[PDB]
Structure formats: C-alpha cells, structure tokens
Amino acid sequence: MEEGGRDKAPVQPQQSPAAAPGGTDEKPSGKERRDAGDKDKEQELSEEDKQLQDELEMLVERLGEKDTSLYRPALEELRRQIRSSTTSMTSVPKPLKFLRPHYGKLKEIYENMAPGKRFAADIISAMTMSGERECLKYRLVGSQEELASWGHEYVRHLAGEVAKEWQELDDAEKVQREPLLTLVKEIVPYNMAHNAEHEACDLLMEIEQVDMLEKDIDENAYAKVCLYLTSCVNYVPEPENSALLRCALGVFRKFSRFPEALRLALMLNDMELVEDIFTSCKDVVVQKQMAFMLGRHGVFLELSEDVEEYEDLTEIMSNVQLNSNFLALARELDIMEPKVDDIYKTHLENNRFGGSGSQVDSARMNLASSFVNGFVNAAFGQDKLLTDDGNKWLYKKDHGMLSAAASLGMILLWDVDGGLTQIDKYLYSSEDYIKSGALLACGIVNSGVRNECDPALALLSDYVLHMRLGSIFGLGLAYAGSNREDVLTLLLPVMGDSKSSMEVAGVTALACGMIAVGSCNGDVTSTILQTIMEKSETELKDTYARWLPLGLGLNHLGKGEAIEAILAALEVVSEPFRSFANTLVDVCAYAGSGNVLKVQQLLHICSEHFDSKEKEEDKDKKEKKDKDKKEAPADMGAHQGVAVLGIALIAMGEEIGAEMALRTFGHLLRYGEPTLRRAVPLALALISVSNPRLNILDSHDADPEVSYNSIFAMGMVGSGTNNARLAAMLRQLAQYHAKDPNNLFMVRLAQGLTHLGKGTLTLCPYHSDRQLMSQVAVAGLLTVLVSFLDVRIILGKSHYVLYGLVAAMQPRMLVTFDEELRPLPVSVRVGQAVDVVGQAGKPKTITGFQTHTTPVLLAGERAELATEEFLP
Amino acid sequence: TYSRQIKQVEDDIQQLLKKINELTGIKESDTGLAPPALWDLAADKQTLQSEQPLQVARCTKIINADSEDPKYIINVKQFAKFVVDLSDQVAPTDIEEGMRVGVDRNKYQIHIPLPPKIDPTVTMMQVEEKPDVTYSDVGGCKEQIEKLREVVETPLLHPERFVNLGIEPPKGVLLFGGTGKTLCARAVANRTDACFIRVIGSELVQKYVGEGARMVRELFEMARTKKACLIFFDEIDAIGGARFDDGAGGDNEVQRTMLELINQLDGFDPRGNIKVLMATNRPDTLDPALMRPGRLDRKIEFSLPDLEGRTHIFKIHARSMSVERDIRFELLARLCPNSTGAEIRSVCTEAGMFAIRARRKIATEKDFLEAVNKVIKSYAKFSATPRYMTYN
Amino acid sequence: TPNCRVALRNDSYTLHKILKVDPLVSLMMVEKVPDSTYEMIGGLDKQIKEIKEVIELPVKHPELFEALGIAQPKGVLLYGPPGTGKTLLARAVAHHTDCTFIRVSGSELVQKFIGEGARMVRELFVMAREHAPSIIFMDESEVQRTMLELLNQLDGFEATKNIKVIMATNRIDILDSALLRPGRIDRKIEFPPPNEEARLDILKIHSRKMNLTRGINLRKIAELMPGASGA
Amino acid sequence: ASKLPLVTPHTQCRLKLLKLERIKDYLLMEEEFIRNQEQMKPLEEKQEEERSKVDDLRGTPMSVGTLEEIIDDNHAIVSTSVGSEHYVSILSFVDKDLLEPGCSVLLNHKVHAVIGVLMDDTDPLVTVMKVEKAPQETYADIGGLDNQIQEIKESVELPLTHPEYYEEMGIKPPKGVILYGPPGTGKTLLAKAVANQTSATFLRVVGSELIQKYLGDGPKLVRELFRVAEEHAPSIVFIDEIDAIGTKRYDSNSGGEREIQRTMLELLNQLDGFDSRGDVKVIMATNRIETLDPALIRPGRIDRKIEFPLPDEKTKKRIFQIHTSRMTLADDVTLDDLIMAKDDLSGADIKAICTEAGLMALRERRMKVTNEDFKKSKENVLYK
Ligand SMILES: Nc1ncnc2c1ncn2[C@@H]1O[C@H](COP(=O)(O)OP(=O)(O)OP(O)(O)=S)[C@@H](O)[C@H]1O
Ligand SMILES: Nc1ncnc2c1ncn2[C@@H]1O[C@H](COP(=O)(O)OP(=O)(O)OP(O)(O)=S)[C@@H](O)[C@H]1O
C-alpha cells in the first residue's frame, strides 16, 4: 500500500484543480490550457477500463468537488472553448464526484450547456439528465400544459436527438432506451412522440426492428386506454414504414380492431388489399382474417380481380376449412385416428376392485352414453351405425334425444361433407328432441362453414315449426362465422315476439346477439325493453339473468372505450336482482390487458357484506366477471388470480367461495398445469354435500391429460360411495370432454402469441349457465354437449402450392428473451429436429431450417414458408 | 435509473406478501396436518361424524358357514376365532369363504368384505405409466414388428377378426439376440393401453423359502382379477437354468419357484385374458418345459440389422444434431461390420463430443471417421460381442 | 436427550419424570479383553518406541505433522508367532492415551447393538467419530476384506481424526495384496520370538505375583525354555 | 414467495416495477379480503383455533401409525405395533397426499383414526455414503496426465455447468464412465478431486461389500440404493473395485456364484432400466477389467472408457515436486537419481518415500530431510 513519490495526482492534479480559482479569475491563459490538459488527463488515462482506481477519478473529487462547484456553478461565464473542456472533464467523474443521489442533479455540471460522445469515442459509459427532464421537469412542465415554454420547446427535439443517440452511441442495450425515452415522455400523448420517432425508425437499420417489437408489445398487452389507443398504432406501422415486410399486420394489428378503432381494422385490410405483392404473404394475412381471429370476411374479397388473387376469398371462406378436412381425412388417417370406442373396455377393472362387481347400474348415465358418441368421435372420426349410443337412448328421457342427435354433429365435427346425408335417415321421426338435435346438427356440422347449409334451409324447416327452441340454435350457430344483417332481420321478431314461453326468448339474445359485434343498438334497446317488461316483475329464478342479459354484453364486447357505460349501464339501472344485468357489458370489454383499477372494484363493490341470502347471485356474477381480464396476461396475472382467489374467496366464502370460486379456471384456459388443474381436485377430492354438491360436482378443458389416475381412483372408491343416480353423467362426460380428439384443443385465445380468435361468444353461455342446479338433468342438455363451435387446431405445416417438401421443423418452448446480446437466443427445446406435421403445441413456437429464410412470417400458425437458397 | 426504488418496492412488497401469507397461515409446517387454509372442512360435523356415528369395523377373515342360518366362522389376527354373524344391512351372499371382511370391535359381527390381500411389494410393479417410445424408431425388425403386433395387440384390438374363423389366438412369445430386445419391449409397453405389468425376475431370489412362490401366486391372482392384462418378463435366466441338480442340494430354491411359475399357465382352468413375453441373454441353457407349446408359441429374433435398417438408424440418431448437410451415410454403415443401433448412437455421440471439443457446431465426415475408428477398433478389444454371438 | 429413560404417568400417558448405557461399553463388557499397561512389557522395547511414534504423535501434535508438511499415517500392522504381545502391547498402547479400546471379530452376538440389519460393518463409524479418542482392533480371510472396508473409507473421505486400527496375523506373506498397496498401509513392526533377556524378564514379570521361597534363580529356568512362546 | 417467474428484463424499464406494483395491488386486495372476513365475522381466532379443535379431536396419546393399505374414502385399515390392525377412519386435516404403504402415520387413541403422519428420520444407511464435505484439493494438485483427465472433466463437470453446449450441439451427454489400469495410478484419488470440484450429490461404496452371508439381499440392496440415489438430486454415485465381487470368494458367503451372477445381473439391468433412468451418471474403477463380465461393457450402459497409464519419469519429477513442495527438505535433494530406482514405480511411491523420510527425521527430531534418508527410504519401502 505505497503512497508517495510517484503520486503525481497529489501534486499536479491536486493543485491545478485546487488553484483553479487561483488560476481562472484574472487569468485567461493559465485557466484554459491547463484545463484542457486536465481534460486530456482525465480522458486519456481513464478510458482504458484497467485502473478504475484512477489517479483523478479517486483523487480529483477529494478537493475538486467544492472547487468545481466554484468552477462551473459559481463562475457563470464558462465561454466557448473552455466549457467544452469543463463539460468533458468534470462530467465523466461527475457521477462519481457526487454521492448516490444523482437522479436530481445531473444538471448543475451538464445542464448549463450540452458539450456539443466525443470523449466517448474510446469509452462506452447525461442521457440520465434528459430522462430527468422528461420524467419530472417535463412532467410538471406539461402535465396539463401540453404546450409551454423552453422546457418543452427544446425538450422535444432534445428527446429526439438523444433518441437518435440511443441506437447511435454503442448499438448495445442502450438501443432499448428509446422506448424508455418515448413512452414515459408525455405519458398519455404518445402520438406526439412516436410520430417523431418512427420516421427515424425507418432509416436507422432493418434488423433491430424485433427487439423493440417484442418489448413494445409487452408494453401493450396490458396498456392504459390512452396507451392501448396510441402506442399500439404507434408500434403498428413498423412493418408498414420502418420495414418493408409488412406481413406482421394481420395477427399483430387485430388488437387495434375492436379496442382501438372499429374501422382501422378494415382500413388496414384495405392497406393489404392495396399492396398485393405478391401471392404468399397476401394469403397469409387474409387467411386468419376469416377463420382465425374474426368473421364477416368470406364476402369481403370478391372484387373485380377474381381469378386466384381476389378469388382467394372462396378459399379463406370454405375451401381452407375443406383443406383441413382433407387433412383430417388423410393425415389423421395416417397417424392414429380410426373411425372410433374402447372407453368401456377401459372401465373393465371397475368390477374386481375390492369386492363384488356389477353394482353400478346408473340411469342418468345415458347422458354420458350420448357422450360416448359425441366426444370420442370428434374431428372426423366418421361412423356408420356406431350411433347406437345415440339411437337406442334416442328412441327409449325425452330431453335425451337432443343429446343423441347433438353427438352426431360432434361425429362429423366441423364437417362439410354429408350432413344432408347423415341426418336424412334420422330426421323424419317427429320426436321433439330427435329432430331438435338433428336440426341443431344442421348448424353444428356447417359451423364455420357458413355456406348454403342452413341460412333458412335446414333450421327454417323447424322455425316454421315454432323443435321451436333449437331452431335458432343451429341456425345462428352456422352464422356464428357470419354477421350478415339478413339473418338478424330474419329472427329479430323472435325476441320481438315476447313469447309466453321463456325457454326460447331467454337464449334468443344469445343467438341473435352473437352474430354481431358492433353497432345497431336496436338489439340492445328491444332486449332491455323486454327486460324491464318481464325481468322487472321478478326476483326469482335466474333464467332471466342466465339467458337474457348476456346478449347485451356479447353485442358490445372488446371495446375499452367506456362509451358503452353511460349507455347500457344507464339502461339496466334497476332493482338489485335486475342490476344483475347492470355491470356485465361494463366489464365485457377488457379481455387481454391489466387495469387493476378495474380489478379492485371487482372486490370493493361487494366483498362479503355478510350476504344473508341477499346478493349471492350478484356476487357470483361479480366473481364471474373477475374471471375475465386474465384470459391473456402475457404472463402477468396467471398466478395473480390462482393465488388471490384461492386465498380470499375459496378459503373465506359464504356461497361465492364455496360454489363460484372454481369456474375461474374453467373460463381461464385449457393449458394443463399442476398449479390450478390439480387444485380443483382439492375441492373435488372432497365432495362436501353440505352446499349443493352439484356445485362441486358441476374436465371442461381440452388437451388430453394423464389425470386419469386420481379420476379412476375416485371411481374405484366410488363403487360404494360417490353415487351415480345423477353423477354417472358427471363421471364419464368429464372423462370424455378433455380427450375428445387427441387433437382439436387450441381454443384458449392464444394465437400468434395471444391474439384472440374467439371463441368467446359461442362458449360463454355454458360456463355462464351452470348457476346452479335444476339444469343438471333437464334444462341443461340444450348446451351440455355442443355449446361452443368456434374451434379453429394444428399449426405445423408447409401449405405451399404443392406440399412438396415435408417440412423443416424443430418445435420449441415459450420464449423469454427480452434484453440479451446479439443475436438473441430463441429457445432451449432444440432437441427434437424432426419433419412432422404434428399437433399445434400449447406452449409452442416452431423454428424452421433448411434455408427457407421464412420470408412469409418470421413471427400465424399456418406458416406458408416461401423459400430461397441464396446461401451457397 | 430508478434502481433503488424499483428493487425496494420489489422486495418490500414481497415481504408484505410474506406477512399477509402468514396472516392466513402457511407456517406451523406440520407433520401431517392438511394445508392450513384447507382442512377447515373437518370442523364440527365430519369430525363428530367420522368418529361418533362411525366405528372401526375391525379387519377380519372368514372361515366357513352353513346354510339356512347365518352361523359363520371368523378368523382374526391376534384374537381367537368365533362363531359369528353378519349384518342384515348387507346382502346375505358375498361373505363366502376365502375372503376378507370388516367386523365391529364390540358386537363381533360382519359389515362388509374387503379386497383380497395385497403385499405392496407385489404392488411395486404396476408400472402405471407408458413412456414415449414408438415402433417407428426401432426399424430393421421389418418382419418382426408385425410378427409381434399380431400376437401382441391384434386380438385385443380385434376380438372378432380371429373369432368368427373359430381359431384360438396364440399366447406366448420370447425375445433373444444390445440387439434391442428390451427396446422392442419398451415400444410395445408404451403403445398399448390395457393393464401392463412387468417383473425383473431377479427380484424374486429371497432369503426365506417359498416366499417367491407365494408372491408369484398373488401376482397371478391380481392378474386373473384383471380383465385385460399383459405381463412382461425380464431376463428370467436368473429365475432358473435347469433341474440339472446332482448330489449336494444346490440352487433348489430357484427351481422351486421355476416349476411353480411354469404350472401357472398349463392346464387345469388356465389364465384367460393373459399373454406374456420374456427375453434372455443366452437362451442356450433355458428350461425345456418353458419352451413347451402353449407356453412359448413364438420365437421372434433380434439379429444384427443389415445395413438398411442400419442406414435408417443412422438417419435416426443424427437427424437432431448440427451436421454436414451432404454426407454419404452409406459409407457409415459400410464400416459397421457387426454392431447395434446403440453403437450407432454412440458413434454419433463421440463425433459430437469431438465437435464440441474445440469450437464447431455442425459435423463433418472427419468427425465420423474419428468416432468410428476409435469406437470400432480402439474399443474393439472387449466389445462384449463374442460369447453372446455364440450365445454361450 | 436421546437415550433418556423417562417416567410417565400412565392414566393420560403424561410424560412425568426422568430415568442407561453407552452401547460401546456394552460391547466392551461383551468382549472383556485383557486390559493392561506398559508395566507388564516383556522384551518389546524398540517395538514400544515405534508404536508410540506412530500412534501417540498424531494426536497432540497436529502442527508438527505439518511443520514437517508430511502426510499423517492411518494404520498399523504387525506379525509374529502364537502369543507374543500382539494384543498385549495393543491394549496398553491404547491405555496410555485414553483410547476407547474397541475390536470386532465379525461376530453377530455383538452385532445387535450397532445395526438392526447392519448389512455392512462400516456402520460402526457412526460411533467411531462419536468418542474420538478411540481405536478399533482387528484379529486374525474375511478379516482382510473387513480391513479393506475400513481403511479405504477414512481415506480423505472421512477427514475425522483420532481413529487408529491394527490387524493381527502371522506369516504376512499369506494375505492379499489389497493390503500391499505401498500407500494403503503405513508401516509394520517385527516381533521376534523371546530370547535370553526377554525370556528372563517375562519370567520376572509373571513371578512377582507369587509368594516365592528365599532365593529364586530366574536365571536357571530362563536357561531352560527354548523360546516356546511368550505364553 | 415464488410469485411469478417473469422478471425477464432485469433492467430499469417499466416492465419490472409494473409487475411489482400490480402484484402489490392484488396482494393488498387479498390481504384486505382476509381482514374483512374477520372484520364483521371473526367467529374464531383461526390462528390456533382451527388447530385447537384439531388438538381436541386428535388423540392426546399419539399412536404410531403404520400404513399398509389405502382406501381414501377418508377411512383405511391401519395396524398396530404388533399388528393388531383394524379399519379406522381418516380425516380431511391429514393432507391425504403422501400416503404410501409402510408409512409412519398417527393414529387416534380411541378409534385409532388417522391423526396424521410423520417424517422419516433417515437414514442409517444413506449417511454411510452421504458425502460430508470436499475431501481433497483441486485436480491441479494431481497433474501428470491431464488429458483423459480433461476428458473426464468434459464428460462429467462440463454437462451440468454448461447445459447449453450439448444443446447447441443438440445431444444429450454420454451415459457411462470408467477407469482401468495397474494397482496405483489414479482412479479413486481422481474421483476425490472430481467431488472436490462438484456441487452435487455424491456417494461412495465398494463392490466387495455387496455380497452378504445371506441369500438374495445384496440385489435388493442394489435396487433400493439406486432408487434412493435417483430420488434425491443432481448426483453421481461411484463404486470402487466391483471386480472384487468377481475375483475372490468368501467362505462366509452362503452360496457362491449362485448369487454373484444374479446380483451382478440385476445390477447391470439397473443401469439400463427401461423405466425412467433419471439424473444419474456413473464412473468405474477396476484393476482387472479384462476378466469381469463384458456384458456390463455394453455400449449405452458405459460410454466414456478411459485407460490409466504408467506416468512418465519426466512427470515423475513433477510428482516429486508435488510431494516435496511444502516440506522443509534439505538442500541435498537430487530427486532424479531417486526417480529411476523402480523402473515402473507409482505416484504413490513418491508420497511413500517422502513421508517415510519425514518419519526418519522425526525419530531424530531433525527438520530438513537429507539424502541418505532418501537412501534408507528407498531401501525400506521397496525391498521386501
Ligand atoms: N434396432 C435398433 N434401432 C434403434 N436403436 C437400437 C436398436 N437396437 C439397439 N438400439 C439401441 O440400444 C439401446 C437399448 O438396447 P437394449 O434394448 O437394452 O438392448 P438388448 O438387446 O435388450 O441388450 P441387453 O439385454 O441390455 S445386454 C438404445 O440406445 C437403442 O437406441
Ligand atoms: N498420478 C498421480 N499423481 C499424483 N499422485 C498420485 C498419482 N497416482 C497415485 N498417486 C497417489 O497415490 C494414491 C493412489 O491413487 P488411487 O486413486 O488410490 O489409485 P488406484 O489406481 O485407484 O488404486 P487401487 O488400484 O484401487 S489400490 C493417490 O491417492 C495419490 O496420493
């Protein structure tokens, strides 16, 4: 620890800073040339990151702190050249010349004048000062003061120059500071900033457009209404202007369709319609625009260039589904799937487990017996006379003949081949539920097809029959993938009839309301009129609350405008049991984001109140709405609910936490995980008949599982206990739901990454219907079988002109790379390098090879995979 | 810039999460108490229900009975036997002999029968899980995969296609030959569905006498109780060579279990929904009585795949590693005189390690050269091949 | 504490009050080997020097062994005829330093104390490092494999100190090379049959305990026994 | 804790803190729900109350349970210390999760119902190989060959510490590792240094002890040992000198090969189990490898196969340096004229001569070790 002799710094770097006031005042030359020498001494022997124990950076702040405060603050006349030295020598130690709190005093040395990176040509690391300005000084300079004096007049282009400085200083993770200079800057008016930043974003480079992409889209997944309204369309035009690939429009701009602007979606569709270069990316965009995120498309692209470019519309409308039909006919033939049915052999060891067998002889088991034909024959396992499970019970439980004829729609699931040929032999029978399920399959089979199968051709033969009930079920279901106003004109007088039987008028708003997503509030007005006519004079059974109010929401979902509030919330301001229909559409419009200000009022408004049989229904629906907002958190709330609800409600409930704290997960997803999937057994390995155990008794998920273990263990211990008089439906319906096909499981609103593709309208009725009892046997087989028909489920393909090459596949896990070094790593599931056309993959992203260069997507789940091998 | 504030707002709200978790209660981590915020179920009723109107009904064993009058004979562990009676509250029938039942501690009367005995040591083979092998990647057995699948799954899959013709399906098959005997078994182990069980026969050599036989018996019991089951046998060479015994009594414990097992499939009301496959290292000295028809129908073999299946394997264990895109894999097999696909995967591994040796990512011919010559001739000296090439 | 016999009121099974053994002591009672000390040494002098050098040194001087920077030893091995002091000197050596004198014959009547099944014998180590100033002894084929199973264990793996062991045998040339690794063993010592002065002194030792007659002449008798043994 | 593993930025952007404050919001909300439940409706303390009633119900004399069977309809059969079993009930508060045949359960006193369970004081056998501490120094202390040594480094340490390199290579690491050479070259010591570097589970046992004077046990010992090893953690177990079990025979053994064969067979199987192999890698160390059963040498069971040679004299000098560095020797050390004595000596012989000469010094209380001491050393240690 030697000190002395060679210690030049306790000599020349000691006195010249110390005697700087003794050599600056009335000394023009001795100040500058020696100050320039100090500048060189601090910029020459310190840039080498070898001795951070600098003779200056660790000794010149001993005395030069008060002295430099006498130099720059106290002099007030730092002229042209000498201050170029002051803000270059008193600035590199200036973070170290002071203590920790620099976040408010990066100014007194630097802010007096910006020294023209010149002392950073050979050293990497006052942008902190510009951040100070933007975040505090600009904040309270333009909070309600959008336009003001110099504090914005220069601060705007100062932010612009430092923004060009982010990706021009070192090209390291300093690049990712431009979002940290554009979004915190003018928090709400992100337009006035990104309008200025994107123009430069076009001209900097065409490679770093992806790190900023993922970062900003994580900024957007959850986003303030202003931020979701501005920064999205500010991050949107990157492939439109900054790059020329433009193919990220479809599945990464749909989020701007419903919340942002109901017309910007179709105008960007027009943008696609203008740049039709060339064949492939056009198909790529337009594919998902009809059958994978929205509808009203199969009649959108029939203009005057209909040969194969514009005539792609019939493809996207019916022939893409037909191509997947040939897929499910040939490939599913190839891999494993035959026509059918061994699930009864499965339950063969239920007779020798502990004693005497042949004791389970349950009757409502017939409900699951229709499932043995519906579920296990989903996705093109067509059959003939195998429908005896849907023929004997069809002809032997009046209500059970609809399940025996709705299982047929699941047999030829999503089919377009032979409905009018498989239903003919089982139509002319005039048993209400046989014809009901058959004419409803007339909409089930062609669901998504929405072609000339049942506009008014199949189910009109049952609405001239007002059988009456399901006549709108399949009719509007075939038009789920449609929004043609003709059908709403065809069946508006259904509710406009105010039928003396509520069994149809109830779900009338569900049928007519689904087909539409936007304006024409005549639906809402007529429905609220019928509400206050009939839902007013009633404080009894929730059919008027389980069936009526949901049409309103499903006609005004996905718009964080808050405009629907003062319109429809003011429309169902009524008695509390009618106020059940009040806050639905209030919350129906915030699917994937995080606005916890909305979450606290899902607990503040009515937590327990001690709820002496007063607001258990309203609070059940409160918890129901709480199931939304979390469907797509970009991994921000997937835990935040499975913990909060389990801790608060399911632990400390009265009728909410004992009967409604579970459907959260059923609404959430069908992924499959030990967090919440095995958590339902916690309330399910304990039946607890005290509360209405058909709450606990009332597998809704897809993605076949190995959870057969505890299910069959309970069924074994269910030989004596766990009776079957009504739960025989339960056991095997649940056993059949998840593993209906080994495929056809991707309906959890995670597409592209998490873009919706819903999914929501056709499904919501069921999981909003099991409230609570009285429909587990009679009034629930209208929707227990074939409720949701929005299922798009495979991604890994080639889909080119020929399907010549097999593929170049290497499927991997979900991505987590946010800030890394170039090039960013992709994923660690690189082990499997195969060439399969395998199933989609729930937590899956596929990374290709074989020099295809992927100029098709690079980010669509039908990777069309253009190619070129300019890499010899 | 806000590093201190962000980290402290992180960890302080984590500490508050901890505090509010403890407010609920997760501490007092117990020795068998349920999750603290869960077990509140058993609070008033269940507690005073599972106990007050509920009695033990002590486990009990039957002896015999008499008609027209209950008068059954019980047997219990430590206490003596008693002429006893059942409960009216159960059907008067299924309390016949050879059975375990429950009997109250006090009235000494029956309430319910219980499953037959278990010996969980024998439960330790209900494998319960099908791993992820597939007949795809085991090629070469071109005329073996089908030869297996026919007498392996087809009857269960088509219990008509062999019935209308009025012919009985075969029952037994064994493997012989690192030819891939266990691999082919694992592939057949996964793909099926019915209750699959296996036993490493080596786990039968006891220290007492006969214990293995009793265990095998209970195994066949739980088998017959099952309605569609398949048993696999692993390396039964240990289970007994032969009754070559002479003078001094040796190895006799083995042959005892041997004969006992071998009875368990021939004549006298046989199994039923029961088929099996075993496999040896050296069949040279296996028992004849097992070779008997009706026990040992098929004799599918695993030899050295030729070059064709070998080429397919070269595809198989290389198609998932960065390599030269234009190698002539033909020569690879061309320098594989006698080997197993295991050794193919081995050569692949060695080449990969020689690649990661200095820097590269994709493979070259040279890597394969060094992998082969080393693995082949440097590792030649032992190579374990001959004494099994003669199966002796 | 563990191994604490206790009183407990029986109605409500309430643990009430307190009441055994150290199992090693029980083992020793089972053995009852001839406890002794240096005084009864008959002609074993340089032997005494060497055994002291090897055993006592690496206890009280852990700084010397490394002041030399030399590795400490781990074991000792002897040989000789039938009864010469193989265990006689072994007992005393342990005695003059307070080493819990322990031996094992691979027996079973002793075995119940250590391990329930006690598949191996290493299980004795559980107590070995429990009473550190202690020694285990090995007598006169499985004794050799036991010696292996003991030596190769406390070989850097078990850094615990204060554990010394000695095997006993004759004609060392008949045991396994597994006990011949030039580093596996530390050193041996020679025990020669009794000569003149040793024979005389052993007489002297095994005489003083008797009420002689006036005049003794150990010398004559010593001139008579032709080194049959020390027994 | 363990809230949400998405803290991906690790930078000073809005992402981290937004996660933090939103979790703050949900945590405040759930804590205030927990508060408001007791606000109007305390109805008990529920800290130690839901537990007081349990203690009330749970039988004061805790009866040692012994799980044998499972009927999870909250009532199964349990036994007694001598096996006076019955058909007692089970309750909700017992977390019916780890129920397994042969478990330490808790039984009520009156009806013997399941009070609960108990953790296992374990194990009177694991500890016997459960590794205590780093026993020795770095490989750098060994030296002499360092090539195949580096090969073992690559095959063993490299995998865990770089679970990426083989991944970019897209290949899982090798399975088997083995040494072989003459008696005294570096097969056990090397393993010692291996463990010295490691940060994973480790055990040690000798094949010689595998034989038991009874019949059949040793096999089951192997089974359960592999099981327990696999059950714990990143682990590499090792057995020294298996060939022992294949070379000698102890008359105390009940039979002969009649158990050797079967035990070794099941053994070899247990490294190629069709079932989940799990996170295990094995090293080997034998003096007579040529003569043991080659079946074990099958590719796939054993992968990395490395020879152990006679170190060279020019390296013997380095060994000298090793065992002579930190001793205050005498200046007369001419190590070379001592190296060539045994034309094929071992690295153990260096330590031998060194420590022997030191003993010679200690006898005469001297300090620096002179050459004639080396003379007498070479004479004693070698000439027998
Ligand atoms: N035909 C094959 N195709 C692909 N891999 C094979 C083939 N044959 C052997 N293997 C490999 O061999 C390993 C498994 O060999 P096993 O099936 O255990 O051998 P085995 O013929 O049963 O020999 P034993 O009984 O263990 S000596 C795996 O690494 C397989 O990949
Ligand atoms: N190459 C070497 N370098 C340094 N020291 C060595 C070397 N070889 C042997 N030694 C020393 O001698 C001891 C013997 O090494 P071990 O690892 O026991 O050899 P081994 O070949 O496994 O022995 P066997 O055959 O089981 S007796 C080591 O612990 C070192 O102290």
Ligand SMILES: Nc1ncnc2c1ncn2[C@@H]1O[C@H](COP(=O)(O)OP(=O)(O)O)[C@@H](O)[C@H]1O
């Ligand atoms: N050198 C000796 N000095 C005194 N007594 C001895 C000597 N050698 C043997 N003995 C006597 O022999 C008996 C013990 O025999 P010991 O030498 O321990 O047997 P071994 O060495 O053959 O195992 C005791 O009675 C002991 O007094």
Ligand SMILES: [Mg+2]
């Ligand atoms: Mg095998």
Ligand SMILES: [Mg+2]
């Ligand atoms: Mg060794």
